[PDB]
Amino acid sequence: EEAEKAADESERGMKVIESRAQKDEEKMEIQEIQLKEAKHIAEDADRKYEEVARKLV
């Protein structure tokens, strides 16, 4: 009974973790894809900065 409760806790755990792992994996990929975009915005933000700053110059 305890092993089955453990089967359920280690399996539920695995599923909770798979759910968490998936939430974190999606957040990982979401933040990674969005990081690439945030970096591209920084490149663009720096790019527009340079275009206007260069005009300033």
Partner: protein, 160 residues
């Protein structure tokens, strides 16, 4: 392309095949048809190499005149080649002063594309002309239609 096509000349079919597949899985988690930072980093941290989103996209800008826009398979491989220790660093500036100087057939210090293209005829091999005027522009960043020594330098990039 000049450097790049001249390069692909050397390494053989199987080199080509291995890096084609290396792209087919360099997209194992791809980003932009090109490769934005995720796959680049993926493959690198699988080992530990260090390309950064910023300079990723910049060396792209250095090269994405093709319209890759980001690290395409092309940029993946130019990154690949951007690491192997093979050769660089510019036949002697004294040598190059001589080389300018013979481009400076006129014995001046200023060379139009004419005696330069005549140096080229003196090279004889199948002469391209687009790339001739391109090289005029390369050199004459002074843009004065005639080219000085450092312009000649700007004109003979990556050359033996």
């Amino acid at each position: 392309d000049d450097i790049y096509k001249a390069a692909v000349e050397q390494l053989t079919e199987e080199q080509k095949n291995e890096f084609k597949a290396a792209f087919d899985i360099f997209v194992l988690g791809a980003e932009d048809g090109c490769i934005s930072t995720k796959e680049l980093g993926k493959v690198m941290r699988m080992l530990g190499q260090n390309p950064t989103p910023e300079e990723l996209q910049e060396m792209i800008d250095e090269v994405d005149e093709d319209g890759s826009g980001t690290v395409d398979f092309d940029e993946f491989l130019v990154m690949m080649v951007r690491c192997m220790k093979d050769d660089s660093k510019g036949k002697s500036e004294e040598e190059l002063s001589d080389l300018f100087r013979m481009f400076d057939k006129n014995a001046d210090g200023y060379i139009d594309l004419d005696e330069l293209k005549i140096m080229l005829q003196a090279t004889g091999e199948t002469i391209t002309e687009d790339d001739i005027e391109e090289l005029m522009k390369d050199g004459d960043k002074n843009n004065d239609g005639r080219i000085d020594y450092d312009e000649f330098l700007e004109f003979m990039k990556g050359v033996e």
